[model samples]
Target: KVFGRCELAAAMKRHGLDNYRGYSLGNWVCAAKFESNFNTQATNRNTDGSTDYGILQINSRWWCNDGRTPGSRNLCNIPCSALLSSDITASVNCAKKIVSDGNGMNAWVAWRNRCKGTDVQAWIRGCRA
Candidate 1:
């Protein structure tokens, strides 16, 4: 029951995050887990109930993909944002911009300290850590 983080880390290892063990993938997974409970087919509906989309909750109204890879879906597959805009390589870079920029995972860590209830990241981290 290692779950998808192993798969993600395998892919990331191919790209060199293998050397990144000193950092907090734990926080990243915390974010990923909170985002959609790691559901690759997750979607959300707005209050008006208009658009329906794929995993990571990429509502199309907020995005127009150039054809699947990072900002778009890879090789014409479903939008990577569906799994999480973070799942997209570019969005990963964007989030890396936030995460690696010296906030030092504190933004997410602070989100843990602040947000509560059914807030699964804090719940999971509290239990796991």
Candidate 2:
């Protein structure tokens, strides 16, 4: 919530996330918007008992651990709360790691379901990046 789309796009460019893992800035921008409405502190509980964290909504099942959660691979070796920071350094890095692991932005459900093959240039409109 601390960032508008343009600000977030600039930040992502500074972090070298605009095209990380062969995905376009539009993909990341749109996916983050859809997943968490650009709110760094976002969290969502899944029906399968997993929790998603941060702007990327990274799931507890394979990424970070929420101490209260029972099953988590914690592959990123981070605490779930760490991703909720407005700074977003850890969250963006973790998301890059996820894209590197496999299918890039397709790893995000929002990207696959909404961002991919869609008109998303407006996600970066008016950004200085």
Candidate 3:
């Protein structure tokens, strides 16, 4: 089954990306919304300090940049949304690699609870379009 934007959003919505559950808007930041809005190629000053890159918030050169291959540290930050826009299956797989640090969706959850003062389910109810 080929998935589209709405489909991806629905999937994220179903993935407990709400405040009621254990997730929040940020918990899904790099998943569908952030990636969609920022083209997955955007980076922002995280409220809790630190930075995030790529669709899954890769964080290049700060969190996971040490001695790998050098050059193009910002390459991975090229917008997972674009990848998703073209072929989501591939993007999802890529998201897994970044999510491995648990900071992927988890990072968004952190922002939601600490900064937004909400959980997973609630944010989704208000944010999900």
lDDT of 1 at 91: 35
lDDT of each residue in 4-122, candidate 3, tens digit only? 44445555455444442343434454244433353444455455444544444444343333233234243334432344343334344444444454443544543443434344343
Regions of model 2 farther than 4 Å from truth? none
lDDT for residue 119 in candidate 2, whole number 0-100: 79
> CA lDDT, every prediction?
0.40, 0.84, 0.42
In model 2, where is the ten-residue run with the lowest total lDDT?
A: 18-27
**Model 2 misses residue 47 by how many Å?**
3.0
Assess the local accuracy of residue 81 in candidate 1 as a C-alpha lDDT between 0 and 100.
42
Candidate 1 residue-pair clash tally: 11
* Residue ranges of candidate 1 with Cα displaced over 4 Å: 1-3, 18-21, 40-87, 109-129
Residue range 54-99, candidate 1, lDDT tens digits: 3223334324232322333232233434434434454344344444
User: What is candidate 1's TM-score against the reference?
Assistant: 0.39
Which candidate achieves the best TM-score against the true structure? 2
Return whichever of 1 and 3 wins on lDDT.
3
Q: How high is each candidate's TM-score? A: 0.39, 0.92, 0.37
